[PDB]
Protein backbone atom coordinates (compact mmCIF):
# COMPACT_ATOMS: atom_id res chain seq x y z
CA UNK A 1 0.00 0.00 0.00
CA UNK A 2 1.06 3.59 -0.71
CA UNK A 3 -0.17 6.97 0.52
CA UNK A 4 -1.80 9.54 -1.77
CA UNK A 5 0.62 11.40 -4.06
CA UNK A 6 2.11 14.39 -2.21
CA UNK A 7 2.92 17.89 -3.48
CA UNK A 8 5.18 19.58 -4.19
CA UNK A 9 7.24 17.03 -6.16
CA UNK A 10 10.66 18.70 -5.96
CA UNK A 11 12.25 21.90 -4.71
CA UNK A 12 14.80 21.81 -7.56
CA UNK A 13 14.45 24.72 -9.95
CA UNK A 14 16.89 23.41 -12.57
CA UNK A 15 14.90 20.44 -13.84
CA UNK A 16 11.28 19.40 -14.18
CA UNK A 17 10.39 15.97 -12.69
CA UNK A 18 9.28 13.24 -15.13
CA UNK A 19 6.14 12.88 -13.02
CA UNK A 20 4.76 16.13 -14.43
CA UNK A 21 4.58 14.87 -18.03
CA UNK A 22 3.24 11.51 -16.80
CA UNK A 23 0.42 13.19 -14.89
CA UNK A 24 -0.35 15.57 -17.71
CA UNK A 25 -0.73 12.71 -20.18
CA UNK A 26 -2.60 10.25 -17.96
CA UNK A 27 -4.43 12.38 -15.39
CA UNK A 28 -4.26 16.15 -16.06
CA UNK A 29 -6.49 16.64 -13.03
CA UNK A 30 -5.96 14.32 -10.11
CA UNK A 31 -6.10 14.21 -6.33
CA UNK A 32 -2.99 15.00 -4.27
CA UNK A 33 -2.15 15.71 -0.62
CA UNK A 34 -0.62 19.03 0.47
CA UNK A 35 1.88 19.66 3.26
CA UNK A 36 -0.97 20.48 5.65
CA UNK A 37 -2.57 17.07 5.12
CA UNK A 38 -5.43 18.49 3.04
CA UNK A 39 -6.48 16.93 -0.25
CA UNK A 40 -6.51 19.00 -3.44
CA UNK A 41 -6.97 18.67 -7.19
CA UNK A 42 -3.70 19.17 -9.06
CA UNK A 43 -4.24 20.55 -12.58
CA UNK A 44 -1.33 20.06 -15.01
CA UNK A 45 -2.43 20.59 -18.64
CA UNK A 46 -2.49 23.93 -20.45
CA UNK A 47 -6.19 23.55 -21.28
CA UNK A 48 -7.30 22.73 -17.72
CA UNK A 49 -4.97 25.25 -16.08
CA UNK A 50 -6.40 28.02 -18.26
CA UNK A 51 -9.96 26.85 -17.58
CA UNK A 52 -9.45 27.13 -13.84
CA UNK A 53 -7.67 30.51 -13.92
CA UNK A 54 -10.33 32.00 -16.23
CA UNK A 55 -13.30 30.91 -14.08
CA UNK A 56 -13.78 33.20 -11.07
CA UNK A 57 -15.92 30.53 -9.41
CA UNK A 58 -12.49 29.11 -8.61
CA UNK A 59 -11.79 31.81 -6.03
CA UNK A 60 -8.48 33.14 -4.66
CA UNK A 61 -10.22 35.07 -1.88
CA UNK A 62 -12.07 32.02 -0.56
CA UNK A 63 -8.84 30.06 -0.01
CA UNK A 64 -8.54 32.17 3.18
CA UNK A 65 -11.84 30.95 4.63
CA UNK A 66 -11.66 29.31 8.06
CA UNK A 67 -11.96 25.53 7.79
CA UNK A 68 -10.95 25.38 4.11
CA UNK A 69 -8.56 22.73 2.84
CA UNK A 70 -5.20 24.54 2.77
CA UNK A 71 -2.14 24.38 0.51
CA UNK A 72 -0.11 25.96 3.34
CA UNK A 73 -0.52 28.24 6.35
CA UNK A 74 -1.40 31.92 5.91
CA UNK A 75 1.57 34.23 6.42
CA UNK A 76 -0.60 37.35 6.09
CA UNK A 77 -3.91 38.36 7.67
CA UNK A 78 -6.81 36.60 5.90
CA UNK A 79 -8.24 39.88 4.56
CA UNK A 80 -4.96 40.48 2.72
CA UNK A 81 -5.51 37.43 0.52
CA UNK A 82 -8.09 39.63 -1.26
CA UNK A 83 -5.42 42.35 -1.65
CA UNK A 84 -6.13 43.33 -5.26
CA UNK A 85 -9.88 43.24 -4.64
CA UNK A 86 -9.41 45.59 -1.71
CA UNK A 87 -7.27 47.90 -3.86
CA UNK A 88 -9.91 47.82 -6.61
CA UNK A 89 -12.76 48.54 -4.18
CA UNK A 90 -10.84 51.53 -2.80
CA UNK A 91 -10.60 52.96 -6.33
CA UNK A 92 -6.81 52.58 -6.29
CA UNK A 93 -6.21 50.02 -9.06
CA UNK A 94 -5.33 52.41 -11.91
CA UNK A 95 -3.08 54.50 -9.66
CA UNK A 96 -1.15 51.50 -8.36
CA UNK A 97 -0.72 50.06 -11.85
CA UNK A 98 0.55 53.36 -13.23
CA UNK A 99 3.11 53.64 -10.42
CA UNK A 100 4.67 50.23 -11.09
CA UNK A 101 5.20 50.46 -14.86
CA UNK A 102 8.84 50.29 -15.98
CA UNK A 103 8.21 53.32 -18.20
CA UNK A 104 8.79 55.95 -15.50
CA UNK A 105 11.39 58.55 -16.59
CA UNK A 106 14.91 57.43 -15.69
CA UNK A 107 13.81 54.12 -14.17
CA UNK A 108 15.44 51.95 -16.83
CA UNK A 109 18.67 53.95 -16.66
CA UNK A 110 18.64 53.50 -12.88
CA UNK A 111 18.27 49.74 -13.38
CA UNK A 112 21.17 49.60 -15.83
CA UNK A 113 23.40 51.76 -13.62
CA UNK A 114 22.58 49.60 -10.59
CA UNK A 115 23.19 46.35 -12.45
CA UNK A 116 26.48 47.64 -13.83
CA UNK A 117 27.65 48.80 -10.40
CA UNK A 118 26.81 45.45 -8.78
CA UNK A 119 28.70 43.61 -11.54
CA UNK A 120 31.70 45.97 -11.32
CA UNK A 121 31.93 45.21 -7.59
CA UNK A 122 31.87 41.46 -8.22
CA UNK A 123 34.58 41.76 -10.86
CA UNK A 124 36.75 43.80 -8.48
CA UNK A 125 36.40 41.24 -5.69
CA UNK A 126 37.23 38.38 -8.06
CA UNK A 127 35.67 34.98 -8.70
CA UNK A 128 33.81 33.15 -7.43
CA UNK A 129 30.81 35.49 -7.18
CA UNK A 130 27.32 34.74 -5.84
CA UNK A 131 24.84 35.92 -8.49
CA UNK A 132 21.82 35.56 -6.23
CA UNK A 133 22.92 37.25 -3.06
CA UNK A 134 25.23 39.82 -4.67
CA UNK A 135 23.47 40.50 -7.99
CA UNK A 136 19.90 39.32 -8.65
CA UNK A 137 18.44 40.00 -5.19
CA UNK A 138 20.13 43.39 -4.58
CA UNK A 139 19.03 44.43 -8.09
CA UNK A 140 15.44 43.45 -7.27
CA UNK A 141 15.61 45.24 -3.92
CA UNK A 142 17.07 48.44 -5.42
CA UNK A 143 14.44 48.44 -8.18
CA UNK A 144 11.59 48.15 -5.70
CA UNK A 145 12.88 50.86 -3.36
CA UNK A 146 13.05 53.14 -6.43
CA UNK A 147 9.59 52.13 -7.65
CA UNK A 148 8.10 52.63 -4.17
CA UNK A 149 9.89 55.96 -3.60
CA UNK A 150 11.56 54.79 -0.40
CA UNK A 151 15.21 55.16 0.65
CA UNK A 152 17.60 52.65 -0.90
CA UNK A 153 19.16 52.19 2.53
CA UNK A 154 15.88 50.74 3.86
CA UNK A 155 15.88 47.95 1.28
CA UNK A 156 18.09 45.41 3.08
CA UNK A 157 15.98 45.34 6.26
CA UNK A 158 12.72 44.96 4.32
CA UNK A 159 14.33 42.26 2.18
CA UNK A 160 15.36 40.20 5.23
CA UNK A 161 11.69 39.58 6.08
CA UNK A 162 11.20 37.64 2.88
CA UNK A 163 12.91 34.30 3.64
CA UNK A 164 10.17 33.87 6.26
CA UNK A 165 7.30 35.86 4.72
CA UNK A 166 7.24 33.68 1.62
CA UNK A 167 7.52 30.38 3.43
CA UNK A 168 5.18 27.58 2.38
CA UNK A 169 4.58 26.04 5.78
CA UNK A 170 2.21 23.42 7.17
CA UNK A 171 1.72 25.59 10.26
CA UNK A 172 1.51 29.29 11.20
CA UNK A 173 4.87 31.04 11.54
CA UNK A 174 5.40 33.28 14.60
CA UNK A 175 8.27 35.18 12.93
CA UNK A 176 6.01 36.05 9.98
CA UNK A 177 3.71 38.03 12.27
CA UNK A 178 6.58 39.86 13.97
CA UNK A 179 8.03 40.91 10.61
CA UNK A 180 4.62 41.74 9.09
CA UNK A 181 3.66 44.05 11.94
CA UNK A 182 7.07 45.77 11.83
CA UNK A 183 6.93 46.23 8.06
CA UNK A 184 3.39 47.63 8.24
CA UNK A 185 4.58 50.12 10.87
CA UNK A 186 7.42 51.11 8.55
CA UNK A 187 5.07 51.72 5.62
CA UNK A 188 2.66 53.65 7.86
CA UNK A 189 5.59 55.88 8.80
CA UNK A 190 6.46 56.34 5.14
CA UNK A 191 2.94 57.63 4.46
CA UNK A 192 3.47 60.33 7.11
CA UNK A 193 7.02 61.17 5.97
CA UNK A 194 7.21 64.50 4.10
CA UNK A 195 10.39 63.36 2.31
CA UNK A 196 8.47 60.68 0.43
CA UNK A 197 6.98 62.30 -2.65
CA UNK A 198 7.84 59.96 -5.53
CA UNK A 199 6.96 56.46 -6.69
CA UNK A 200 4.14 54.29 -5.42
CA UNK A 201 4.36 55.45 -1.79
CA UNK A 202 4.58 59.09 -2.85
CA UNK A 203 1.39 58.66 -4.87
CA UNK A 204 -0.43 56.77 -2.13
CA UNK A 205 0.65 59.46 0.33
CA UNK A 206 -1.00 62.12 -1.82
CA UNK A 207 -4.18 60.12 -2.51
CA UNK A 208 -4.48 59.47 1.24
CA UNK A 209 -4.98 63.21 1.83
CA UNK A 210 -7.35 63.66 -1.11
CA UNK A 211 -11.09 63.99 -0.29
CA UNK A 212 -12.02 61.22 -2.74
CA UNK A 213 -10.05 58.71 -0.63
CA UNK A 214 -10.76 60.02 2.88
CA UNK A 215 -12.45 56.79 3.98
CA UNK A 216 -9.86 54.41 2.58
CA UNK A 217 -8.16 52.88 5.61
CA UNK A 218 -4.57 53.61 6.61
CA UNK A 219 -4.17 49.84 7.00
CA UNK A 220 -4.86 49.35 3.29
CA UNK A 221 -2.41 52.06 2.22
CA UNK A 222 0.36 50.50 4.35
CA UNK A 223 -0.55 47.00 3.16
CA UNK A 224 -0.15 48.01 -0.47
CA UNK A 225 3.44 49.09 0.21
CA UNK A 226 4.33 45.92 2.12
CA UNK A 227 2.75 43.47 -0.33
CA UNK A 228 4.01 45.13 -3.50
CA UNK A 229 7.56 45.36 -2.15
CA UNK A 230 7.50 41.76 -0.96
CA UNK A 231 5.82 40.12 -3.94
CA UNK A 232 7.84 42.20 -6.39
CA UNK A 233 11.22 41.60 -4.77
CA UNK A 234 10.81 37.88 -4.13
CA UNK A 235 9.34 37.29 -7.59
CA UNK A 236 11.85 39.28 -9.64
CA UNK A 237 14.86 38.17 -7.59
CA UNK A 238 13.85 34.53 -7.76
CA UNK A 239 12.94 34.60 -11.45
CA UNK A 240 16.16 36.35 -12.50
CA UNK A 241 18.24 33.94 -10.44
CA UNK A 242 16.75 30.79 -11.94
CA UNK A 243 16.73 32.37 -15.43
CA UNK A 244 20.48 32.98 -15.08
CA UNK A 245 20.93 29.26 -14.34
CA UNK A 246 18.97 28.32 -17.46
CA UNK A 247 21.06 30.73 -19.52
CA UNK A 248 24.37 29.53 -18.07
CA UNK A 249 23.40 25.94 -18.92
CA UNK A 250 22.78 26.96 -22.54
CA UNK A 251 26.08 28.40 -23.81
CA UNK A 252 24.82 28.49 -27.43
CA UNK A 253 21.89 30.70 -26.38
CA UNK A 254 24.05 32.75 -24.01
CA UNK A 255 26.42 33.50 -26.90
CA UNK A 256 23.56 34.35 -29.27
CA UNK A 257 22.08 36.83 -26.78
CA UNK A 258 25.51 38.33 -26.16
CA UNK A 259 26.04 38.80 -29.90
CA UNK A 260 22.50 40.02 -30.63
CA UNK A 261 21.11 41.75 -27.52
CA UNK A 262 18.04 42.82 -29.48
CA UNK A 263 16.93 39.20 -29.01
CA UNK A 264 17.00 39.51 -25.22
CA UNK A 265 13.28 40.30 -24.85
CA UNK A 266 12.35 37.16 -26.84
CA UNK A 267 14.91 35.24 -24.76
CA UNK A 268 13.39 36.50 -21.50
CA UNK A 269 9.91 35.52 -22.67
CA UNK A 270 11.12 31.95 -23.22
CA UNK A 271 12.96 32.00 -19.88
CA UNK A 272 9.62 33.03 -18.28
CA UNK A 273 7.87 30.15 -20.01
CA UNK A 274 10.32 27.51 -18.75
CA UNK A 275 10.75 29.05 -15.30
CA UNK A 276 10.25 26.85 -12.25
CA UNK A 277 10.31 29.71 -9.72
CA UNK A 278 6.80 29.03 -8.36
CA UNK A 279 7.22 26.14 -5.93
CA UNK A 280 3.53 25.25 -5.58
CA UNK A 281 0.50 25.30 -7.84
CA UNK A 282 -1.63 28.46 -7.65
CA UNK A 283 -4.42 27.79 -5.12
CA UNK A 284 -8.13 28.37 -5.70
CA UNK A 285 -11.21 27.23 -3.78
CA UNK A 286 -14.29 26.05 -5.69
CA UNK A 287 -17.42 28.09 -4.94
CA UNK A 288 -19.66 25.78 -6.99
CA UNK A 289 -19.66 22.27 -8.43
CA UNK A 290 -17.65 22.57 -11.66
CA UNK A 291 -16.60 19.98 -14.25
CA UNK A 292 -12.86 20.07 -15.02
CA UNK A 293 -11.79 17.38 -17.47
CA UNK A 294 -12.94 14.02 -16.08
CA UNK A 295 -13.48 15.36 -12.55
CA UNK A 296 -16.48 17.05 -10.98
CA UNK A 297 -14.85 19.45 -8.55
CA UNK A 298 -17.09 20.07 -5.58
CA UNK A 299 -17.87 23.35 -3.83
CA UNK A 300 -15.35 23.85 -1.03
CA UNK A 301 -12.53 21.86 -2.63
CA UNK A 302 -8.99 23.10 -3.22
CA UNK A 303 -7.58 23.26 -6.74
CA UNK A 304 -3.88 23.79 -7.51
CA UNK A 305 -2.91 25.14 -10.91
CA UNK A 306 0.56 23.82 -11.75
CA UNK A 307 2.23 26.54 -13.84
CA UNK A 308 4.95 24.25 -15.23
CA UNK A 309 2.24 21.77 -16.14
CA UNK A 310 0.77 24.34 -18.51
CA UNK A 311 4.08 25.85 -19.63
CA UNK A 312 5.71 22.54 -20.62
CA UNK A 313 2.57 21.10 -22.25
CA UNK A 314 3.67 19.89 -25.71
CA UNK A 315 0.13 20.24 -27.07
CA UNK A 316 0.52 24.01 -26.61
CA UNK A 317 4.31 24.48 -26.75
CA UNK A 318 5.92 21.88 -29.05
CA UNK A 319 9.41 20.79 -27.90
CA UNK A 320 8.51 22.38 -24.56
CA UNK A 321 11.90 21.91 -22.91
CA UNK A 322 13.71 23.87 -25.63
CA UNK A 323 14.11 27.63 -25.67
CA UNK A 324 13.04 28.72 -29.12
CA UNK A 325 12.97 32.44 -29.84
CA UNK A 326 10.63 32.17 -32.84
CA UNK A 327 7.48 30.62 -31.37
CA UNK A 328 4.18 31.90 -32.78
CA UNK A 329 2.59 32.04 -29.29
CA UNK A 330 5.47 33.38 -27.17
CA UNK A 331 3.54 35.34 -24.50
CA UNK A 332 0.78 32.76 -24.09
CA UNK A 333 2.58 31.09 -21.18
CA UNK A 334 1.19 31.26 -17.64
CA UNK A 335 4.30 32.58 -15.85
CA UNK A 336 2.33 35.65 -14.70
CA UNK A 337 -0.91 33.74 -14.26
CA UNK A 338 -4.11 34.39 -16.18
CA UNK A 339 -7.53 35.98 -15.66
CA UNK A 340 -8.72 38.00 -12.68
CA UNK A 341 -5.43 37.71 -10.80
CA UNK A 342 -2.94 38.16 -13.64
CA UNK A 343 0.26 39.68 -12.23
CA UNK A 344 -0.01 43.48 -12.00
CA UNK A 345 3.80 43.74 -12.11
CA UNK A 346 4.37 41.78 -15.32
CA UNK A 347 5.91 44.64 -17.29
CA UNK A 348 8.27 45.55 -14.46
CA UNK A 349 9.27 41.91 -14.00
CA UNK A 350 10.07 41.56 -17.69
CA UNK A 351 12.15 44.73 -17.70
CA UNK A 352 14.07 43.80 -14.54
CA UNK A 353 15.16 40.50 -16.13
CA UNK A 354 15.92 42.02 -19.55
CA UNK A 355 18.17 44.72 -18.09
CA UNK A 356 19.85 42.37 -15.61
CA UNK A 357 20.68 39.86 -18.34
CA UNK A 358 21.82 42.52 -20.82
CA UNK A 359 24.16 43.95 -18.20
CA UNK A 360 25.51 40.55 -17.14
CA UNK A 361 26.25 39.39 -20.68
CA UNK A 362 28.09 42.64 -21.46
CA UNK A 363 30.22 42.61 -18.26
CA UNK A 364 30.72 38.84 -17.90
CA UNK A 365 30.36 37.26 -21.33
CA UNK A 366 32.24 34.20 -20.09
CA UNK A 367 29.94 33.64 -17.10
CA UNK A 368 29.70 29.98 -16.02
CA UNK A 369 28.85 27.98 -12.90
CA UNK A 370 31.76 27.70 -10.46
CA UNK A 371 30.41 24.49 -8.91
CA UNK A 372 28.75 21.43 -10.48
CA UNK A 373 25.06 22.15 -10.89
CA UNK A 374 24.04 19.41 -8.44
CA UNK A 375 25.88 21.35 -5.72
CA UNK A 376 23.30 24.13 -5.68
CA UNK A 377 21.27 24.08 -2.46
CA UNK A 378 17.55 24.40 -3.17
CA UNK A 379 15.42 26.21 -0.61
CA UNK A 380 12.66 23.97 0.79
CA UNK A 381 9.16 24.68 2.13
CA UNK A 382 9.17 28.05 0.36
CA UNK A 383 6.80 29.66 -2.14
CA UNK A 384 9.63 30.00 -4.65
CA UNK A 385 12.32 27.64 -5.84
CA UNK A 386 15.73 29.23 -5.49
CA UNK A 387 19.31 28.20 -4.86
CA UNK A 388 20.64 29.54 -1.59
CA UNK A 389 23.82 30.66 -3.36
CA UNK A 390 24.63 30.85 -7.09
CA UNK A 391 28.45 30.61 -7.37
CA UNK A 392 29.81 31.69 -10.76
CA UNK A 393 33.11 32.47 -12.44
CA UNK A 394 33.81 34.28 -15.72
C1 LIG B 1 9.21 37.73 -13.07
C2 LIG B 1 8.58 38.39 -12.10
C3 LIG B 1 7.18 37.96 -11.58
C4 LIG B 1 6.54 36.79 -11.73
C5 LIG B 1 7.05 35.51 -12.43
C6 LIG B 1 5.24 36.91 -11.09
C7 LIG B 1 4.28 35.91 -11.02
C8 LIG B 1 2.99 36.10 -10.56
C9 LIG B 1 1.87 35.18 -10.69
C10 LIG B 1 1.91 33.80 -11.39
C11 LIG B 1 0.80 35.72 -10.10
C12 LIG B 1 -0.64 35.12 -10.02
C13 LIG B 1 -0.94 34.48 -8.67
C14 LIG B 1 -2.29 33.80 -8.72
O15 LIG B 1 -3.05 33.98 -9.71
O16 LIG B 1 -2.61 33.06 -7.74
C17 LIG B 1 1.20 37.01 -9.58
C18 LIG B 1 0.39 37.88 -8.88
C19 LIG B 1 0.80 39.03 -8.25
N20 LIG B 1 2.02 39.68 -8.47
FE21 LIG B 1 3.53 38.99 -9.67
N22 LIG B 1 5.14 38.18 -10.55
C23 LIG B 1 6.31 38.85 -10.86
C24 LIG B 1 6.62 40.16 -10.56
C25 LIG B 1 5.85 40.99 -9.77
C26 LIG B 1 6.15 42.37 -9.43
C27 LIG B 1 7.37 43.15 -9.95
C28 LIG B 1 5.16 42.80 -8.62
C29 LIG B 1 5.00 44.19 -7.97
C30 LIG B 1 5.94 45.14 -8.02
C31 LIG B 1 4.24 41.72 -8.42
C32 LIG B 1 3.12 41.74 -7.64
C33 LIG B 1 2.10 40.83 -7.68
C34 LIG B 1 0.89 40.96 -6.90
C35 LIG B 1 0.55 42.07 -5.90
C36 LIG B 1 0.03 39.77 -7.28
C37 LIG B 1 -1.38 39.45 -6.72
C38 LIG B 1 -2.39 39.75 -7.83
C39 LIG B 1 -3.81 39.49 -7.38
O40 LIG B 1 -4.00 39.02 -6.23
O41 LIG B 1 -4.73 39.75 -8.18
N42 LIG B 1 4.68 40.63 -9.14
N43 LIG B 1 2.54 37.21 -9.87
O1 LIG C 1 5.98 41.30 3.52
C2 LIG C 1 5.18 40.38 2.91
C3 LIG C 1 4.68 40.58 1.63
C4 LIG C 1 3.86 39.60 1.04
C5 LIG C 1 3.55 38.45 1.76
C6 LIG C 1 2.79 37.42 1.22
N7 LIG C 1 2.59 36.16 1.64
N8 LIG C 1 1.85 35.56 0.84
C9 LIG C 1 1.55 36.36 -0.20
C10 LIG C 1 2.13 37.54 0.02
O11 LIG C 1 2.14 38.69 -0.71
C12 LIG C 1 0.95 39.03 -1.26
C13 LIG C 1 0.92 39.82 -2.40
C14 LIG C 1 -0.29 40.19 -2.96
C15 LIG C 1 -1.47 39.78 -2.37
C16 LIG C 1 -1.44 39.01 -1.21
C17 LIG C 1 -0.22 38.64 -0.65
C18 LIG C 1 4.09 38.25 3.02
O19 LIG C 1 3.79 37.12 3.72
C20 LIG C 1 4.87 39.23 3.61
Query: The domain that contains 271 carries what CATH number?
Result: 1.10.630.10
Give the dihedral sign, CA 367/129/163/204: negative
| E-state strands within 266-329 | 282-286, 290-292, 295-297, 302-305
Nearest ligand 2 atom, CA 158: 1
60 annotated binding-site participant: no
341 annotated binding-site participant: yes
For 327, residues 6+ apart whose C-beta sits below 8 A from its C-beta are 270, 317
State whether the beta carbon of 45 lies less than 6 angstroms from ligand 2.
Answer: no
State whether the beta carbon of 231 lies less than 6 angstroms from ligand 2.
Answer: yes
* Overall domain count for the chain: 1
Instruction: Give the span between the Cα atoms of 27 and 49, in whole angstroms.
Output: 13
For 264, residues 6+ apart whose C-beta sits below 8 A from its C-beta are 257, 354, 357, 358
Write the residue with the smallest CA distance to atom 4 of ligand 2: 227
Write the residue with the smallest CA distance to atom 16 of ligand 1: 282
Strand bridging mode 58-59 / 282-286: antiparallel
Checking 191-198 for CB contacts under 8 A at 24+ apart, the result is 191/218, 191/221, 191/222, 191/225, 196/149, 196/150, 197/149, 198/149
Q: Which ligand is nearest to the CA of 305?
A: 1
Instruction: Give the span between the Cα atoms of 385 and 378, in whole angstroms.
Output: 7
Residues linked to residue 290 through DSSP beta bridges, in sequence order: 297
State whether the beta carbon of 226 lies less than 6 angstroms from ligand 2.
Answer: yes
- Given phi > 0 = left and psi -120 to 50 = alpha, else beta, which region is 278? beta
Write the residue with the smallest CA distance to atom 21 of ligand 1: 343
For 208, residues 6+ apart whose C-beta sits below 8 A from its C-beta are 191, 216, 218, 221
- Residue 383 CA to ligand 1 center (angstroms) comes to 12
Write the residue with the smallest CA distance to atom 14 of ligand 2: 227
Instruction: Give the span between the Cα atoms of 29 and 375, in whole angstroms.
Output: 34
Short-list 302, 270, 275, 274, CA closest to 287: 302
235 annotated binding-site participant: yes
Write the residue with the smallest CA distance to atom 3 of ligand 1: 235
- Residue 235 CA to ligand 1 center (angstroms) comes to 7
User: What resolution in angstroms does the PDB record give?
Assistant: 1.5
Instruction: Give the span between the Cα atoms of 255 and 325, in whole angstroms.
Output: 14
Instruction: Give the span between the Cα atoms of 195 and 76, in whole angstroms.
Output: 28
Q: Which ligand is nearest to the CA of 159?
A: 2
284 annotated binding-site participant: yes
Q: Beginning with the edge strand found earlier in the chain, give each strand of the sheet holding 129-130 in spatial order.
A: 129-130, 391-393, 368-369
Residue 225's Cβ-side half-sphere holds a number of Cα atoms within 13 Å equal to: 31
Q: CA–CA distance from 200 to each of 187, 203, 238 (Å)?
A: 11, 5, 22
- Best residue among 343, 349, 356, 357 to mutate for probing ligand 1's pocket (most ligand atoms within 8 Å of CB) is 343
DSSP secondary structure letter of residue 9: -
Range of the domain at 176: 1-394
Amino acid sequence: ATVLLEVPFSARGDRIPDAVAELRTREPIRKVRTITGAEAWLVSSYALCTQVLEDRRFSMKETAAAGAPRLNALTVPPEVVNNMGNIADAGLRKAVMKAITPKAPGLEQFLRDTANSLLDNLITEGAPADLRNDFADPLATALHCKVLGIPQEDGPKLFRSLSIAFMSSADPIPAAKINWDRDIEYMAGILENPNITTGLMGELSRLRKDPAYSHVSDELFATIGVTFFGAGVISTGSFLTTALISLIQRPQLRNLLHEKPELIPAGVEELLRINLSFADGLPRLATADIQVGDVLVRKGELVLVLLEGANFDPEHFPNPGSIELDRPNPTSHLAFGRGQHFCPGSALGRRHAQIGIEALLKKMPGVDLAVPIDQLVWRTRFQRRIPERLPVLW
